[PDB]
């Protein structure tokens, strides 16, 4: 009922939903707060789980929870080192490293479970590599200016990679089904997120409590519906797939959005531009097919 | 002589040239260019036939005829090089100059079988990649059609003299003088239709002395006339594109080290991820022969 491609359909649609409703149903998703939109987001998850189960699929624990700990603390740290990155680096080149990182994940992948990276892998991911530089190719956008921000780039590679791996670890050792991880990482999220908002965030209540009203506090909730598409489908996908592989829709899934803006849009386009497209295309048709022959080889 | 020792050899006499061209010779940004390879090619069939009343090659009516098309293959590989430079940048040349390495890779799937490692496809790859983040570390339309013709002039080219070679069992010698010699006349053919000739004017341009360089240039071209046709014959075709592409990159890394010219961390990426892409090729050989 629920394996193989199927997975890698939902994260698209939903993501390809959750970008449409931050772009068009929320007018300006870019809030002052960003860890407490994450917090609603995460308490819709929540709140949206518990009404599911009594009308029936998840579970609550203590010995789980002091090893899934890590993962939603990686979950968020991740989060906040993407958002210290993209203050100081521009998004392609954002995407440059975040392209890199199917690297190091793919071939962490064989040191936390085995498969080795097949050589006709390898040349998706500098396929991928290659687009995005091409694409940077094609754009625009003190000593210490450049410096802090390739910092963070690093620690998000890092907590990247440590999140997506060691959550798939821990999924297949204790079989976690499609809604308990679903469940666990948007719960256990809920402490780290608070903890993130209340270090970085600046809590006045003669300012920052005017600035989210009755009609932002309507946006976190439609967000947070759209969240639960994305939510359910990241877990999945890890889980019947693979590390890598949710690495590489999740980089692949920006394409079609970027295309759509291609042909739905009439603003001004690179050559440059529409090239890395086709070549990230080029780059996810020659990673399928290093999956069928990976498949029918064992 | 057969094997890496190609390679080595291929080497040394590109980083003679570099150095010769770059160095002893003051300036060698030549009025006629043609006139100045027919001089270079004159100087390798010399000195070819000195060798041979001394030890080498042979002479032929049915060999000429189906040697004369990788000639020209040669000639006019050069002239659109020559065009494309005249109005793209050299980064970027070298980025097309590295795409062909691909389809030489896959004509030589066309021309002889030997399929393309999902590995080889990596290092060619890396090496794009390494352009590509060389050009993206600089400065600075016409010229994109010169570029096209420059592609697959050299890929017919390398192709077609490799599946020559290896069908009249021509060796490195032969291949060398049937190559220096048959171009004689079509550089000349290119170099009237294309250079102006004015004994008003150009004559005085080509001194003793500049006659005396193009010499000095003809000595040092016997390296690579001789190398190159050893190297696409005992390696392959691709094997030849991949070590004259990489073959740039410690002459690169020179200037670095030898020079105080101002550098940029792209520039050294580039260099470095060239290097990781030579590792990668080198590999990829490796499993080719012991899988296959
Ligand atoms: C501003 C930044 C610009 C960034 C520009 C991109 C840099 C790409 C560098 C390296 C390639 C990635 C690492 C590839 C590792 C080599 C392949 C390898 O390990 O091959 C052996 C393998 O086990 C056989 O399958
Ligand atoms: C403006 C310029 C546009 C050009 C830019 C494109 C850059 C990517 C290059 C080549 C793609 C190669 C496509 C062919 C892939 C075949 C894979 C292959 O040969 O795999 C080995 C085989 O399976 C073993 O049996
Ligand atoms: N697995 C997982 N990923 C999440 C969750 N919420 C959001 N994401 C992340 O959200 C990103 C895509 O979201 P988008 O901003 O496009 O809506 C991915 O990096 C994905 O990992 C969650 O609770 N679990």
Same mark, same amino acid.
Not at 71 to 83: A, C, D, E, K, Q
Not at 136 to 156: E, K, L
Not at 208 to 215: A, E, K, R
Not at 245 to 266: E, W
């Given at each position: 009922?629920?394996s193989g491609?199927?997975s890698?359909?939902?994260?698209?649609?939903?993501?390809?939903?959750?970008?449409?409703?931050?772009?068009f149903?929320?007018?300006?998703?870019?809030?002052?707060?960003?860890?407490?939109?994450?917090?609603?987001?995460?308490?819709?998850?929540?709140?949206?789980?518990?009404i599911?189960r009594?009308?029936?699929?998840?579970?609550?624990?203590?010995?789980?929870?002091?090893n899934w700990?890590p993962?939603?603390?990686?979950?968020?740290?991740?989060?906040?080192?993407?958002?210290?990155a993209?203050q100081?680096?521009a998004?392609?080149?954002?995407?440059?490293?975040?392209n890199?990182?199917?690297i190091?994940?793919?071939?962490?992948?064989?040191? @936390?479970?085995?498969? /080795?990276? $097949?050589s %006709?892998?390898? &040349?998706s991911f500098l396929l991928?590599?290659? *687009?995005?530089?091409?694409?940077?190719?094609?754009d625009?956008?003190?000593?210490?200016?450049?410096?802090?921000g390739?910092?963070?780039?690093?620690?998000n590679?890092?907590?990247?990679?440590?999140?997506v791996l060691?959550?798939?670890?821990?999924?297949?050792?204790?079989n976690?089904?499609?809604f308990?991880?679903?469940?666990?990482?948007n719960?256990l999220?809920?402490?780290i997120?608070?903890?993130?908002?209340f270090?970085v965030?600046?809590?006045?209540?003669?300012?920052?409590?005017?600035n @989210?009203?009755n009609? /932002?506090? $309507?946006? %976190?909730?439609? &967000?947070?519906?759209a969240?639960?598409?994305? *939510?359910?489908?990241?877990?999945?996908?890890?889980?019947?797939?693979?590390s890598?592989?949710?690495?590489m829709?999740?980089?692949l899934?920006?394409?079609?959005?970027?295309?759509s803006?291609?042909?739905f849009?009439?603003?001004?386009?690179?050559?440059?531009?529409?090239?890395?497209?086709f070549?990230?295309?080029?780059?996810?048709?020659?990673?399928?097919?290093?999956?069928?022959?990976?498949?029918?080889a064992?």
């Amino acid at each position: 009922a629920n394996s193989g491609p199927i997975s890698i359909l939902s994260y698209c649609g939903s993501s390809i939903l959750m970008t449409v409703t931050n772009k068009f149903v929320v007018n300006l998703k870019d809030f002052n707060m960003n860890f407490v939109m994450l917090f609603v987001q995460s308490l819709v998850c929540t709140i949206t789980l518990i009404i599911l189960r009594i009308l029936g699929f998840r579970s609550l624990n203590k010995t789980d929870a002091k090893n899934w700990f890590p993962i939603s603390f990686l979950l968020v740290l991740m989060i906040y080192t993407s958002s210290k990155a993209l203050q100081y680096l521009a998004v392609p080149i954002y995407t440059i490293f975040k392209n890199l990182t199917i690297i190091l994940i793919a071939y962490g992948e064989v040191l @936390f479970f085995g498969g /080795s990276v $097949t050589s %006709m892998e390898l &040349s998706s991911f500098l396929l991928m590599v290659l *687009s995005s530089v091409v694409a940077t190719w094609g754009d625009q956008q003190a000593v210490a200016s450049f410096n802090p921000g390739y910092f963070w780039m690093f620690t998000n590679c890092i907590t990247s990679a440590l999140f997506v791996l060691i959550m798939r670890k821990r999924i297949k050792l204790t079989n976690f089904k499609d809604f308990d991880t679903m469940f666990y990482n948007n719960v256990l999220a809920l402490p780290i997120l608070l903890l993130f908002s209340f270090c970085v965030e600046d809590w006045s209540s003669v300012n920052l409590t005017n600035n @989210f009203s009755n009609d /932002s506090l $309507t946006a %976190m909730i439609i &967000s947070g519906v759209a969240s639960v598409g994305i *939510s359910y489908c990241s877990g999945w996908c890890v889980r019947v797939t693979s590390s890598t592989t949710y690495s590489m829709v999740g980089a692949l899934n920006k394409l079609p959005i970027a295309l759509s803006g291609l042909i739905f849009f009439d603003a001004p386009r690179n050559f440059l531009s529409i090239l890395s497209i086709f070549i990230g295309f080029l780059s996810g048709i020659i990673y399928a097919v290093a999956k069928q022959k990976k498949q029918q080889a064992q």
